Amino acid sequence: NKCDVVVVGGGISGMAAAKLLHDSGLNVVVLEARDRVGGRTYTLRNQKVKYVDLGGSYVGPTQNRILRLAKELGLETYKVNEVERLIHHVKGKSYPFRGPFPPVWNPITYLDHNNFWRTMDDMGREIPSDAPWKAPLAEEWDNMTMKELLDKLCWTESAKQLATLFVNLCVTAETHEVSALWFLWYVKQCGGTTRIISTTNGGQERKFVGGSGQVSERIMDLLGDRVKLERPVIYIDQTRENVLVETLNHEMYEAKYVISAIPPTLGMKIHFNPPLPMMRNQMITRVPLGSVIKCIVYYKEPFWRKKDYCGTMIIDGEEAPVAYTLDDTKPEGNYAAIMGFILAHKARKLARLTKEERLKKLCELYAKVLGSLEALEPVHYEEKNWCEEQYSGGCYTTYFPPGILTQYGRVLRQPVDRIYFAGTETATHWSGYMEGAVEAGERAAREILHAMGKIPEDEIWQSEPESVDVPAQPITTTFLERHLPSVPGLLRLIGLTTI
Amino acid sequence: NKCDVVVVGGGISGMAAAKLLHDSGLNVVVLEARDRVGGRTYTLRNQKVKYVDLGGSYVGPTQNRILRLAKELGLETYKVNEVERLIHHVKGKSYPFRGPFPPVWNPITYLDHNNFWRTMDDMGREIPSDAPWKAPLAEEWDNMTMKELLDKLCWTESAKQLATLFVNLCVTAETHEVSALWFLWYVKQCGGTTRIISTTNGGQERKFVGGSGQVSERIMDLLGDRVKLERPVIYIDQTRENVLVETLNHEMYEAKYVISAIPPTLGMKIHFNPPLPMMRNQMITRVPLGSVIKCIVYYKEPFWRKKDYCGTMIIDGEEAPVAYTLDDTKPEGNYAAIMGFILAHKARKLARLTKEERLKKLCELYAKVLGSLEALEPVHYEEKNWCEEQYSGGCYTTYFPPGILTQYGRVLRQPVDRIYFAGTETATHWSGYMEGAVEAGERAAREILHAMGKIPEDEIWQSEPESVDVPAQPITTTFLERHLPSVPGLLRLI
Numbered sequence: 001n002k003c004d005v006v007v008v009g010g011g012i013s014g015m016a017a018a019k020l021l022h023d024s025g026l027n028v029v030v031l032e033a034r035d036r037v038g039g040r041t042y043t044l045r046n047q048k049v050k051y052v053d054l055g056g057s058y059v060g061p062t063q064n065r066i067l068r069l070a071k072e073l074g075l076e077t078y079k080v081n082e083v084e085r086l087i088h089h090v091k092g093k094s095y096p097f098r099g100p101f102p103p104v105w106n107p108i109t110y111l112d113h114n115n116f117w118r119t120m121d122d123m124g125r126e127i128p129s130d131a132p133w134k135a136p137l138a139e140e141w142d143n144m145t146m147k148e149l150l151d152k153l154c155w156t157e158s159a160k161q162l163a164t165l166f167v168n169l170c171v172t173a174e175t176h177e178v179s180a181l182w183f184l185w186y187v188k189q190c191g192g193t194t195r196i197i198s199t200t201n202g203g204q205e206r207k208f209v210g211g212s213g214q215v216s217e218r219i220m221d222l223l224g225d226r227v228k229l230e231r232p233v234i235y236i237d238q239t240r241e242n243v244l245v246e247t248l249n250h251e252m253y254e255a256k257y258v259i260s261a262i263p264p265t266l267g268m269k270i271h272f273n274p275p276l277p278m279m280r281n282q283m284i285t286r287v288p289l290g291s292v293i294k295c296i297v298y299y300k301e302p303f304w305r306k307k308d309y310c311g312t313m314i315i316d317g318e319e320a321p322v323a324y325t326l327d328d329t330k331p332e333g334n335y336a337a338i339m340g341f342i343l344a345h346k347a348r349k350l351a352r353l354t355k356e357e358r359l360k361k362l363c364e365l366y367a368k369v370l371g372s373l374e375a376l377e378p379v380h381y382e383e384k385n386w387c388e389e390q391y392s393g394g395c396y397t398t399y400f401p402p403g404i405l406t407q408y409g410r411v412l413r414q415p416v417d418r419i420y421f422a423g424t425e426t427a428t429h430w431s432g433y434m435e436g437a438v439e440a441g442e443r444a445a446r447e448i449l450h451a452m453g454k455i456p457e458d459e460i461w462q463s464e465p466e467s468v469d470v471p472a473q474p475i476t477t478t479f480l481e482r483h484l485p486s487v488p489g490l491l492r493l494i495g496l497t498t499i
Numbered sequence: 500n501k502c503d504v505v506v507v508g509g510g511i512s513g514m515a516a517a518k519l520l521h522d523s524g525l526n527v528v529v530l531e532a533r534d535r536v537g538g539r540t541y542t543l544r545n546q547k548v549k550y551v552d553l554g555g556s557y558v559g560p561t562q563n564r565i566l567r568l569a570k571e572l573g574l575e576t577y578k579v580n581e582v583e584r585l586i587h588h589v590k591g592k593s594y595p596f597r598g599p600f601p602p603v604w605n606p607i608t609y610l611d612h613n614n615f616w617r618t619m620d621d622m623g624r625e626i627p628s629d630a631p632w633k634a635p636l637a638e639e640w641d642n643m644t645m646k647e648l649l650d651k652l653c654w655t656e657s658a659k660q661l662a663t664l665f666v667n668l669c670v671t672a673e674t675h676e677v678s679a680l681w682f683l684w685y686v687k688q689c690g691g692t693t694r695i696i697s698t699t700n701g702g703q704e705r706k707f708v709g710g711s712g713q714v715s716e717r718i719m720d721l722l723g724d725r726v727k728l729e730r731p732v733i734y735i736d737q738t739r740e741n742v743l744v745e746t747l748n749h750e751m752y753e754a755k756y757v758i759s760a761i762p763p764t765l766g767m768k769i770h771f772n773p774p775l776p777m778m779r780n781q782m783i784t785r786v787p788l789g790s791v792i793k794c795i796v797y798y799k800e801p802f803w804r805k806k807d808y809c810g811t812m813i814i815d816g817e818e819a820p821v822a823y824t825l826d827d828t829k830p831e832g833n834y835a836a837i838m839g840f841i842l843a844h845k846a847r848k849l850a851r852l853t854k855e856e857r858l859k860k861l862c863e864l865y866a867k868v869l870g871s872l873e874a875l876e877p878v879h880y881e882e883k884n885w886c887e888e889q890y891s892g893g894c895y896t897t898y899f900p901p902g903i904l905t906q907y908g909r910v911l912r913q914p915v916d917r918i919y920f921a922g923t924e925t926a927t928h929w930s931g932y933m934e935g936a937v938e939a940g941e942r943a944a945r946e947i948l949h950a951m952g953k954i955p956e957d958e959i960w961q962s963e964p965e966s967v968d969v970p971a972q973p974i975t976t977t978f979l980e981r982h983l984p985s986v987p988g989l990l991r992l993i
C-alpha cells in the first residue's frame with residue numbers, strides 16, 4: 001500500500017533510483033513485472049557455463065557511475081581478452097591485424113575510410129548531449145536515415161560496407177531504419193567513434209566477475225521486501241492527492257511520486273488517468289527497440305589463442321549470421337567461449353530456425369573465419385533472443401526513426417505531474433548502456449528529492465569522479481588523420497591544379 | 500462473463516465484426532475502452548453545428564462495404580459541394596480552376612507534374628494489395644522514405660512541393676517519416692491517385708446525412724447490452740481452454756475467440772499470456788499513427804459560392820496552418836462551414852496555441868485565400884486534435900516507417916492462436932478508411948466462422964456488389980498523359 005516513491009521497473013535504472021532514495025531515508029517500493037530483477041541484463045548460472053551474461057555485459061573507461069555502483073556492491077571487473085590479433089573477414093577471406101582498427105591499403109579507400117570516421121566525430125561535435133534537437137542542422141540530419149548519410153559520405157563500397165556493419169553492431173538496427181541525427185548523437189554521447197568501438201580503452205574493455213546481473217540482484221538484497229516481483233504495472237492515477245499505481249495481479253500502491261524506469265515505448269502497457277499530454281502520448285508509439293540475438297558457443301579450450309587470434313572477429317557479408325565476436329572465456333582461462341551477436345534483420349530471419357540450427361551455422365562461420373576445424377566441436381551453447389521479451393521489447397536499446405528525435409525528443413524526461421523518468425534512454429552519457437541506466441536512475445531520484453525540498457536545484461545533475469580501477473586514456477588523432485582530404489576533396493584539388 | 504466471441508474495440512471495425520457474428524447466431528460481447536462507440540469517427544451534436552464529424556467523414560464510389568452497411572442501418576449520403584471553382588493558392592496568390600487537378604502552365608513543369616503522378620500509379624501496379632512485401636522491388640522501395648523518392652523523381656520544386664502536400668494530406672505524416680513502399684501501396688489499394696484525391700468520383704464525394712458516427716451508434720442499438728462501455732481491455736490469457744479477457748474496471752470475460760479491432764500499436768496496452776510471438780511483439784512498437792487536427796469554421800452563409808468558389812482550397816507553403824479545405828455546409832445550404840486539416844508537424848506546433856488562436860490563424864488564411872473579409876467573421880468553431888487520444892493514438896491511420904512493411908508486414912493479420920485481427924489497418928481495399936474498417940471487420944468475423952466450421956475456407960474473403968446509389972466512373976487517362984516524356988526523358992531525347 002503506502003510509501004514515498006513507487007519505482008516502476010527493477011532494472012539497473014529502477015534499482016539505482018531506489019537505492020539512492022532509500023539511502024536518503026525515504027520509503028520506496030520497486031514494482032517489477034518479471035519474476036526477477038535485472039531487466040535487459042540477465043546472468044544465467046548452470047554447471048556448464050558457471051555464469052554468463054545473456055544481456056548487457058561490457059563496461060569500460062568513462063563509465064564511472066556503473067563502475068562505482070558496482071564497486072560499492074562488492075563486484076570486480078576483469079579485462080576482455082585482446083592480447084592476440086583481431087580478424088577482419090571480408091569477401092570470404094580473413095585479414096588478421098593488431099591495434100583497434102582494421103588497416104586499409106588502397107589509398108583512395110584509405111582516404112574514404114579516414115574521412116567517414118572523422119566526419120562522424122565532426123558532426124557529433126555540433127550536437128549537444130543533453131539536447132540533440134538543438135544541433136544547428138538538427139532538422140536536416142533528422143530527416144535523413146543513416147543509409148542516406150552513408151550514401152553521401154562514402155565514395156567506396158568498402159567504407160560503406162564497414163560503416164553499415166558499424167551501425168548494425170552499434171544500434172541493432174538497419175541503416176535505413178534510423179535517423180542520422182539520432183545515431184550521430186548516440187555515438188557522440190558515448191565519447192565518439194573510437195571510445196564506442198574499442199575493447200582496450202573503450203566500451204568493451206571489461207566485464208563483471210560473476211556477471212552484470214549481480215548489480216540488480218545485490219540492490220534487491222539491500223532493499224529486502226521493498227522489491228515486488230511479478231507486479232506488472234497496468235494503471236496510474238494522478239487525479240487525486242496521492243498517486244495510485246495499480247498492478248496486474250491486483251494490488252494497489254499509493255505514493256507521493258512515481259519513477260518510470262522502463263523503455264519509453266513500454267509506457268504503452270500502462271493506462272493513464274488523466275490521459276498523458278499529447279506529445280508523450282504519441283512519442284511512446286514512435287520509439288521501437290532494435291533486434292538482436294546474443295549467442296555464446298563453448299569450447300574445451302580457447303583454441304584461437306594458439307593461432308595468435310584473440311577471438312575478436314569483424315565479419316562482413318550478408319551470408320554471415322554473426323557480424324561481430326569477442327572472446328568470452330573466464331579470467332581464469334577456462335570455459336572457453338566465443339560471444340557473437342546476430343543483428344537487426346538477421347535476428348528476425350534466423351529466429352525461424354532451431355537453437356541447434358543456429359549453433360551449427362555459427363560453428364561453420366567461426367571455422368571458416370578462424371581457419372580452424374576445432375570450431376566445429378562445441379561443448380555447450382547458450383543464446384537469448386531479446387526480440388521475444390514483452391517486458392524489454394528488444395535490445396540493446398531504443399532507436400529513433402527519421403523525424404522523431406526533433407519532434408518528440410524534448411519530451412522523454414519531461415516530468416508528467418508527479419511521474420519522473422529514468423531508464424537508460426533518458427541518460428545523457430552512455431545512454432543505451434548500463435552506465436546510462438545508473439545516470440538516469442540517480443538523476444530521476446534526485447529530481448524528486450528536489451521536488452520534496454530536500455536538495456537544491458543545482459544538485460539534480462551531479463558529475464562523477466573517474467574510476468581509479470578503470471582509468472581512461474584520452475582519444476588521440478594524428479596530424480595526417482586530421483588533415484588528409486576526402487575523396488571529393490582530392491578530386492577538387494585535381495580539378496584545380498588542372499586549370 | 501461467458502460468450503462465443505469477445506470483440507475488443509467498438510469502432511466501425513469491431514461493430515461490423517460483431518453485427519455479422521450476432522447475425523449468424525453467436526453470442527458476442529464488445530469491449531470498448533471509452534464512454535462511447537465510433538473510435539476514430541465521432542459526431543458531435545449541439546445547436547450551433549446541428550451535427551458535425553470531427554473524425555472520419557468522407558465516403559465515395561468503390562467503397563461499397565461502408566455504403567451498404569450504412570444503407571442497411573438507414574443512413575443516407577449527400578454530395579460534398581464541388582459546383583464552383585477549386586482554388587490553388589501558391590506563393591501567396593490564388594489560382595482558381597475547375598476539373599480535379601490544378602493546371603500547370605510552364606511546359607517543363609507540366610512534364611514533371613504529369614510524370615510524377617504517372618510514376619506513382621506505374622509503381623503501384625507492381626504492388627499486390629493483399630501482400631505489398633511481395634512487390635518485385637519491395638526492399639528497395641521500403642528502404643527509402645517518400646522524401647528520397649520525391650527527390651529522385653521531381654525535377655522541379657513545384658512538383659516536389661505539390662507531391663509533399665499530397666503526402667501530408669493523404670497520410671498525416673511527413674515525407675521523410677514514411678516508407679516509399681508503404682505509401683505507394685496505400686495509394687494503389689485506394690484505386691490509384693485520381694480515385695484517392697478526387698471529390699467528384701473519388702474518396703471525397705460524399706458524407707453521411709447526420710454524421711458517420713451513426714454507423715457505430717446504430718450497431719450498438721441493434722446489439723443492446725452486448726456492448727460494454729468504459730471497458731479498456733488490459734489482459735488476455737490464452738493458456739487455458741477458453742480465452743480469458745480482463746478489463747481495467749476489473750471484469751472478466753470468457754470466450755472461444757477474440758477479435759482485436761484496435762490500432763496495431765494499441766495492442767501494446769494489453770498484457771499477454773502466453774507472451775506474443777517475437778514478430779508481433781516487436782511489430783506493435785514499430786507502427787505509429789499520424790498527427791492531425793480537424794477544424795471546422797462556421798459562417799452565417801456560404802459566401803465563397805457567390806464569388807464562384809466551391810470551398811476547396813489547396814494551399815501551399817510552410818506558413819499556412821491548413822493545407823487543404825473542403826466545403827462543410829449541409830445539403831440544405833445552411834450551417835455554412837469550411838473544414839480544414841492541420842497536418843503532420845503543423846499539428847504538433849499549433850497544438851501549443853489556444854482554440855481561439857487557432858481560429859484566428861485560420862480565418863486570416865481563408866480571408867487571404869478566398870480573398871474575402873467575410874472569412875474574418877466566424878459564427879462558430881469546432882476542432883479535434885486526434886494526437887491527444889490514448890485510445891486512438893492519432894489519425895487518420897497507421898503509417899509505416901522505412902524498412903518496417905517488409906520485415907513485419909506479413910504479421911498484421913496473422914492470427915495468434917485464437918486471437919484474430921480486424922481494424923482498418925488490416926484491410927486490403929481502402930485500408931486506413933471507414934471502408935477498410937468494414938472489410939477487416941467482416942473478414943476477421945468470417946475467419947472465426949470458418950475456424951468454427953460454419954463456412955468454407957473460400958468464403959472468408961467475400962467480394963462486394965457495386966452501390967447503386969454511389970456508382971463509380973472508370974479512371975481515364977489521355978494519349979498524351981500516357982506517352983509524354985519525363986524531364987530526364989526529354990533531356991535524353993536532346
Ligand SMILES: *[C]C1=C([C])[C]=C2C(=[C]1)N([C][C]([O])[C]([O])[C]([O])[C]OP([O])(=O)OP([O])(=O)O[C][C]1O[C](N3[C]=NC4=C3N=[C]N=C4[N])[C]([O])[C]1[O])C1=NC(=O)[N]C(=O)C1=N2/[C]=[C]/[C]=N/[C]1[C][C]C2=C1[C]=[C][C]=C2[O]
Nearest residue numbers: 009011012013033039040056057058233395423424433434
Ligand atoms: C539486451 C542487451 C544485450 C543482449 C546486449 C547489450 C545490452 C542489452 N546493453 C543494454 C543494457 O542492458 C541496458 O542499457 C540496461 O540494462 C537498461 O536498463 P534500464 O534502463 O534499467 O531498463 P531495463 O533493464 O529494461 O529495466 C526495465 C525493468 O522494467 C520492467 N518492466 C517493464 N514493464 C513493466 C515493468 N515493471 C513493472 N511494470 C511494467 N509495466 C522490466 O521487466 C525490467 O526489469 C548493454 N549495456 C552495457 O552497458 N554493456 C553491454 O555489453 C550491453 N550489451 C550490449 C553490448 C554491445 N556492444 C557492442 C559490441 C561492439 C560495439 C557495440 C556497441 C557499439 C559499438 C560497438 O563497436
Ligand SMILES: *[C]C1=C([C])[C]=[C@@]23C(=[C]1)N([C][C]([O])[C]([O])[C]([O])[C]OP([O])(=O)OP([O])(=O)O[C][C]1O[C](N4[C]=NC5=C4N=[C]N=C5[N])[C]([O])[C]1[O])C1=NC(=O)[N]C(=O)C1=N2/C3=[C]\[C]=N\[C]1[C][C]C2=C1[C]=[C][C]=C2[O]
Nearest residue numbers: 508510512532538539555556557696732894922923932933
Ligand atoms: C481521426 C480521423 C480524421 C480526423 C479524419 C479522417 C479519418 C480519421 N479517417 C479514418 C477513419 O475514421 C478510420 O479508418 C476508422 O474510423 C477506423 O476504424 P477501426 O478500424 O474500427 O478502429 P477505431 O475507429 O480506431 O476503433 C478502435 C476502438 O477501440 C477502442 N480501444 C482502444 N484500445 C482499447 C479499446 N477498447 C477496449 N480495450 C482497449 N484496450 C477505441 O477506443 C475505439 O473505439 C477517415 N476515414 C474515411 O473513410 N473518411 C474520412 O474522411 C476519414 N477522415 C479522413 C479523411 C481525409 N481525407 C483527405 C482529404 C483529401 C485527401 C485525403 C486523403 C487522401 C487523399 C486526399 O486527396
